[PDB]
From TrEMBL, chain A:
Record-level GO BP terms: malate metabolic process
Family, as annotated: Belongs to the LDH/MDH superfamily. MDH type 2 family.
NAD listed as a keyword: yes
All copies of domain Lactate/malate dehydrogenase C-terminal, residue ranges: 156-325
Binding site for NADH 1: 14-15, 40, 47, 87, 127, 129, 153
GO molecular function terms noted in the UniProt entry: L-malate dehydrogenase (NAD+) activity; nucleotide binding
UniProt: NAD(+) binding residues: 10-16, 40, 103, 127-129
Organism (species): Trichomonas vaginalis
Gene, per the UniProt record: LDH1
Domain Lactate/malate dehydrogenase N-terminal: 5-150
Record-annotated active site: 185 (proton acceptor)
Keyword field contains Lyase: no
Protein name as annotated: malate dehydrogenase
Length: 337, 334
């Protein structure tokens, strides 16, 4: 086989540091070698050089080579997949609308670089926030690519939710099933327990039939919704290993397929045929599986109760609004030129 | 199967952060679950809590649970293996004897904890500097353990050397063979290329027959010798992912055995009757393999030319001297 070419943006940061080593160790592409394209900005290049020196010093058999660069063409040329980690952080005094706006330019440019230089088969995983909207913008501005080339990361939130629920029920994570994170990130994300089941002592029950309503429909989302802040409070920096774990997990599933019974929340361009009443035109987290050919499918058969319907509708509306903000910002910049 | 209990000292640090997650991912023990024991000091407890929260947020199927503590008994109780990452750093105006001395107390205490609380089959990998001497001291003070329970990490240096030589030759790492790191860390470490071969265009040749003398016996060791500093200069912090990679590599080999033909440099209590003329009584890096029962063996058949003999003798002398410093310090305290 020829080595698989993998792009990591923001490569000098903590996520990039861990992700690059994890991929180079063979965890993503199995027996196949990898060639890492490591992109960052000029002020980060000494830290990127340090990363590459550590990669070298692992003597990884799976690592065919790498390029550490500030240059888009070198970073995107003939890539097979991409981890779009880099994004503009929110500035002091900015609100969510301004965060969406500042990122829209970045992700427009990135969509253009992908279209120009990446393989037509590239799988682009958008991680930098606001990820669903960044993903939509990159896709809209990638003229030679298709919706199947893009997704956004919701597995960190799914993983968080599994551990919380398993701990609450006093079981292992393997004994909880069908927790789903739907829709957007941010305030409108839907951490849905209404499908979920668990096995304890040979009895299988629905999570919402056992746990208190006040837990399920208030406390639980608060714990999930604020978890990142709690780590930053203790760590002094945001999470790194946990989003990396989720990122690899998503990409590996996307590349080679999911396991029987496995349901992974993934942000995808909304499929026209979807069975959950979501309108095409945004990137929306759905319960997904992936076939052996690397194609993502929304899992059929989940139930939409009145609570879930309302939550889905609200997060759908939120995504269309974010899209509007991003597109309007881009239009206003163009007008001003 | 019952979960394997794995200690990481210095757990809140950068190595601990990555090592914990790597192990919890299933990479060390295979299908078997792991129960992590994460030890650090009181001012690091908030960072340690943060680490546990990220571990939780991975929903690792292999993670049976964890202790995160400042308490030695909770950290060492019934452990199957240990990554002894923590050590006392060198203080500003301190010399090497002081580094050995300060760490001797720590490692004496650690050996005592291991003997008192760990399983008798515990596999102890010493990483914190000065690792060979710290390992010796821990072993000497672990009354219910044996030499087979202890080793120290020299694989980071081996991996660095493979990269460097493969890059100088313009070949893949997989096409270079039998590079060995012998002896102590620090200035007396022996980065031996005198056994090494490489393949290219259907020919296998000795490295020393192709590369120039000035590279092999001067430039190369300087590169290996300044590598960690160069990374610290660029990174703003010391290496973390690469020692973690080497640590898991060593421990996994130690648990399940090495692959056919594989030679891993490992610091081990010197075996009586080793074939390389090294005196028992210190922990010394040798070319090793590991059998399917998890027992480490020195690889036989390497050759010791005059250059290598002198290097081996010098690093042996150095190790015995560090041990004397450590033991004299502990004796003065008693």
């Amino acid at each position: 086989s020829e080595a698989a070419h993998v792009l990591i943006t923001g490569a000098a940061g903590q996520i990039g540091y861990i992700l690059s080593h994890w991929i180079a160790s063979g965890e993503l592409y199995g027996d196949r070698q990898v060639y890492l394209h490591l992109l960052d900005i000029p002020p980060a290049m000494n830290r990127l050089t340090a990363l590459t020196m550590e990669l070298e010093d692992c003597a990884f058999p799976h690592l065919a080579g790498f390029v550490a660069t500030t240059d888009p063409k070198a970073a995107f040329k003939d890539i097979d997949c991409a981890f779009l980690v880099a994004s503009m952080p929110r500035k002091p005094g900015q609100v969510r609308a301004d965060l969406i706006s500042s990122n829209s330019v970045i992700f427009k440019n990135t969509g253009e670089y992908l279209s120009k230089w990446a393989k037509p088969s590239v799988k682009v995983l958008v991680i930098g926030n606001p990820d669903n909207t960044n993903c939509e913008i990159a896709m809209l501005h990638a003229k030679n690519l298709k919706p199947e080339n893009f997704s956004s990361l919701s597995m960190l939130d799914q993983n968080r939710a599994y551990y919380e629920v398993a701990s609450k029920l006093g079981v292992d994570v393997k004994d909880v099933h069908d927790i789903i994170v739907w829709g957007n990130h941010g305030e409108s994300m839907v951490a849905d327990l209404t499908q979920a089941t668990f096995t304890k002592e040979g009895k299988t029950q629905k999570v919402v039939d056992v746990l208190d309503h006040d837990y399920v429909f208030d406390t639980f989302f608060k714990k999930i919704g604020h978890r990142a802040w709690d780590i930053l409070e203790h760590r002094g920096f945001t999470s790194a290993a946990s989003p990396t774990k989720a990122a690899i997990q998503h990409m590996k599933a996307w590349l080679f397929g999911t396991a029987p019974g496995e349901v992974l929340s993934m942000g995808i361009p909304v499929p026209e045929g979807n069975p959950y009443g979501i309108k095409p035109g945004v990137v929306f987290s759905f319960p997904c599986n992936v076939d052996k050919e690397g194609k993502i499918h929304v899992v059929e058969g989940f139930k939409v109760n009145d609570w879930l319907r309302e939550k889905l509708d609200f997060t759908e509306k939120d995504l269309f609004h974010e899209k509007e903000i991003a597109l309007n910002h881009l239009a206003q910049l163009e007008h001003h030129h």
